[PDB]
Paper text:
The core of the glideosome consists of an atypical class XIV myosin A (PfMyoA) and a divergent actin (PfAct1). PfMyoA is a short myosin with a conserved globular motor domain and a lever arm that binds two light chains: an essential light chain (PfELC) and myosin tail interacting protein (MTIP). PfMyoA is a critical molecule in the parasite life-cycle because it powers the fast motility (~2 µm.s−1) required during motile sporozoite stages, and is essential for providing the force (up to 40 pN) needed for non-motile merozoites to invade erythrocytes. Here, we present the X-ray structures of full-length (FL) PfMyoA complexed to PfELC and MTIP in two states of the motor cycle.
Author numbering:
A (entry chain F): 2 to 134
B (entry chain D): 72 to 204
C (entry chain A): 435 to 530
D (entry chain A): 627 to 818
E (entry chain A): 98 to 337
Write the structure that this text describes.
Amino acid sequence: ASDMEEKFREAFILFSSCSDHIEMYKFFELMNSFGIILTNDEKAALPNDINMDYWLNFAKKHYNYEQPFKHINNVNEQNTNVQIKIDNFLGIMKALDTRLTESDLNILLQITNPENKTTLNLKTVSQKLTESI
Amino acid sequence: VDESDVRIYFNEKSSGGKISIDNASYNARKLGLAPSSIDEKKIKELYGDNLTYEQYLEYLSICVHDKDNVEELIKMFAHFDNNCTGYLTKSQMKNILTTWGDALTDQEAIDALNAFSSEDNIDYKLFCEDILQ
Amino acid sequence: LCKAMYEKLFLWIIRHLNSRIEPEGGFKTFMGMLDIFGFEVFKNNSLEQLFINITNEMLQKNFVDIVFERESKLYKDEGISTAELKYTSNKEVINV
Amino acid sequence: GQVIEKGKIAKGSLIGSQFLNQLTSLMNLINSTEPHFIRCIKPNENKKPLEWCEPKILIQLHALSILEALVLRQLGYSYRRTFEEFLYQYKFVDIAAAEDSSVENQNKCVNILKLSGLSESMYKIGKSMVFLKQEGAKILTKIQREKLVEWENCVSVIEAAILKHKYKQKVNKNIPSLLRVQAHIRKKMVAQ
Amino acid sequence: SFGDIGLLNHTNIPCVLDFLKHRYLKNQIYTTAVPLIVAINPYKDLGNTTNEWIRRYRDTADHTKLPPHVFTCAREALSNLHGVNKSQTIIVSGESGAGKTEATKQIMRYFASSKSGNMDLRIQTAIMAANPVLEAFGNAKTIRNNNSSRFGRFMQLVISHEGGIRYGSVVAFLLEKSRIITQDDNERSYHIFYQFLKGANSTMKSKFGLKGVTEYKLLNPNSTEVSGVDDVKDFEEVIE
Ligand SMILES: Nc1ncnc2c1ncn2[C@@H]1O[C@H](COP(=O)(O)OP(=O)(O)O)[C@@H](O)[C@H]1O
Ligand code: VO4
Ligand SMILES: [Mg+2]
């Protein structure tokens, strides 16, 4: 799995279920899975049929190698600095219309805060997730 | 198991009496045994890189894998058969075998796929059945 | 018999629709929409026309209440504006 | 589930009585929500485009209380809601002072409003509610709509980084079963 | 130059009539008077209702730059439904033929449009296909309006924060029972009766033994035709 090239591959296979062509919405899942974000202007600026080849080029063309999960840290220098209580933080999650179920969010908690602390901050979620890849 | 073949296959690829794990796999695959990286890493922690005939026999016993069958080996292929036909394309099958574990190379996988059947659409069950013989 | 067969059939299609489109465990935060029959005056008006014009007057009574009567009391109770809202209500015609 | 009734018609079976009670129930259902009004005007009876008939329109200007809705300018405040409904809508502006244990809800509002640059003129914090001027509410929703976007992608990034881990963990279980396919293929390559 | 009626210096009866006169005739029917919104019936499609406009109000950031419309309201209603998590209600008010039923459809079409294409539109399919059936079965031609609603329609809809209807509940009340049996002159019965006795296939014309639109006692034989209405083409759309 060495560098990113072989790690982007493993991902495409999964999100398409080893399909030559991936689903449009599943490609949006796939880009999110590497800390890549787009505007409606760039979102419309995407092909009809999406293959593996394009994805690899796209990943190189996008994915910030310095900070992969910058969009987690982008929530200014007060919210990222302050700790959010486990339950109150999940309130924000469910409110922002999350797709993750009870188990999925528990899985996430088991990855983010594995010491089972009374509270959790954002700069920590990103740091764990960069070591997750 | 053939006692005559074991002694013959050892002497054929031995160096200064001892044998390298790499030769011991080739010799196991000559008998009809399938040693994997898990079988290799177990024998390596014990007697280093080079092993004598006695240490070599205890290696061939791990290569046996009696619990092996079609239903046991298809588990990864079945995880990717969402259409529920019992069939995967040669393209689909090749990527599975290249990405994870004892990562076979593209042409190692491609040739092994054609050696089974000329057809693109391959039944993973009949395939395991064939390669296990 | 013809009246009841048509009305129950029209409402059976509504039930068949609601059987497939309704959420299990009801609604939590839903979006209401109200399309009624608007004020209609002909040369000859009957009970049909009476029930329609009643609906319109009802929708108005609740409009005037929410938009004016309630807002006037809200601003006053919060301690913002003691000022009165001047408006015409159907209070009398709705009661008759 | 229709009541098979025989003899004299009951008060609950009478069309008008059955109509008013259905209407009555519907109105309360609407009173419990936050209504929005669309006031449609029919300009002429001839059913013709670009044809203005001042009488017919004027009656409708009264009957929909369009001219009467003008006195609502006197109020001067566009946004008006309790501390709770406000603080849930505008928590993203600064979750920090938003979920403060020491600071009270009346004062949390003040902080997040002043955080968004607003001055004591654009708002007037009432008895149980927070009021904002049309000018004031524009500022707050502009800042909130930049921050909603910040967390909208922030969540969607976490969403998939776990959805990825889902497919990953469900694949790791099949991996030893696959290693055996890969060891039996090498075995077959030795024979040929 | 401006959308809100309350921005005039003199807000007297004629001054408001003229402000609305010049807006309607220059084909700008929607005029605010916050919280109220005035929609004058243009009687011709201005194209301001099409998908292009839906997408505008949907994906446009500043609400200030956008002109008054049924979609301005549809977005601000959905902005509170998810913003504060409070149930909201839309109310189309006006006389017979003011544009209530049509405006409902436009605001329904707005909620039908989703930003991200990853939704189960199977539920949203039946929801939208119900309306041309509800107008065939519940709406009839009158002297006031040719698509006059003889029934009261009420909906409850769970809409996504990006768009698209997840679930719904169409609750119809008070159907004009008399319209089925007797109809006045130049006034027509429920559209579906005329639609079925014009657009039915040769198989249903023999199995049910269907006769001409004039041959029925429950149907006004002289009012049978409606201007600009093809009950055959409407029936095709009704069946699907
Ligand atoms: N925005 C509009 N553009 C064009 N015609 C319209 C518009 N709104 C309404 N109409 C016309 O008015 C007629 C009646 O509208 P409708 O919504 O059914 O009113 P109501 O609920 O009062 O019966 C429609 O059939 C249509 O021809
Ligand atoms: O307003 V209506 O014409 O639907 O009665
Ligand atoms: Mg109508």
